[PDB]
């Protein structure tokens, strides 16, 4: 994880709701995943801070310091600042980054990545098994289908087979050469009926 003090100046594109997570001082606090965007590529924000929360809505534009990026994945937390941006500080975000950000990943090139890399994406649920402690959801698309694995309240998600799973930071891992999705401590699902 490497820190940038420079003050980069961003415009939000998506934010989820708030949700729980494990601290790294092992307490119970609250944390959203956003997406944002400068004039040349879009990101992937982790937002340990709940009290910037209404920062983060669509279309508002914000100058993020003090951040931390690890796997090409920005964190902003207690010790990282999030202002307003100034007028001058705004440059329209293209529409084709806008649409990249919002794309999701073929399965067949999760299927590609090195062990430890991190995925988001909207996937369909093919067919599930809740085990005694954890889930596991095969998702499909077109190019191929992969197991994802949710513990705790990502175990026993209420969805049914066609139901489209938006995942959130999930981790590849192989296990004989098999890849699969994993949630870890920071992952989201959400779940659209279909």
Same mark, same amino acid.
């Given at each position: 994880? !490497? ?75 207690? #010790?990282?600042? !999030? ?26 090139? *999760?299927?590609?990545? #090195?062990?430890? #890399? ?27 289908? *992969?197991? !994802? ?24 891992? =192989?296990? =004989? ?18």
């Amino acid at each position: 994880a !490497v820190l940038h003090s420079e003050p980069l100046t961003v415009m939000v594109l998506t934010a989820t709701d708030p949700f729980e997570y494990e601290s790294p001082e092992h307490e119970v606090k609250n944390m959203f995943h956003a997406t944002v965007a400068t004039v040349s590529q879009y990101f992937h924000v982790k937002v340990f801070n709940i009290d910037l929360k209404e920062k983060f809505t669509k279309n508002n534009f914000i100058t993020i310091s003090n951040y931390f990026e690890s796997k090409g994945i920005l964190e902003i937390n207690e #010790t990282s600042s !999030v202002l307003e941006a100034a007028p001058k500080q705004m440059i329209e975000v293209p529409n084709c980054i806008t649409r990249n950000a919002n794309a999701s990943p073929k399965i067949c090139d *999760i299927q590609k990545g #090195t062990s430890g #890399t991190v995925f988001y994406g909207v996937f369909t649920l093919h067919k599930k098994k809740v085990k005694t402690q954890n889930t596991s959801y095969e998702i499909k698309d077109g190019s191929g289908s *992969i197991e !994802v694995v949710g513990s705790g309240q990502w175990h026993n998600i209420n969805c049914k087979e066609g139901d489209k799973l938006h995942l959130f930071c999930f981790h590849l891992k =192989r296990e =004989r050469g098999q890849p699969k999705l994993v949630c870890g401590d920071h992952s989201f699902v959400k779940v659209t009926k279909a």
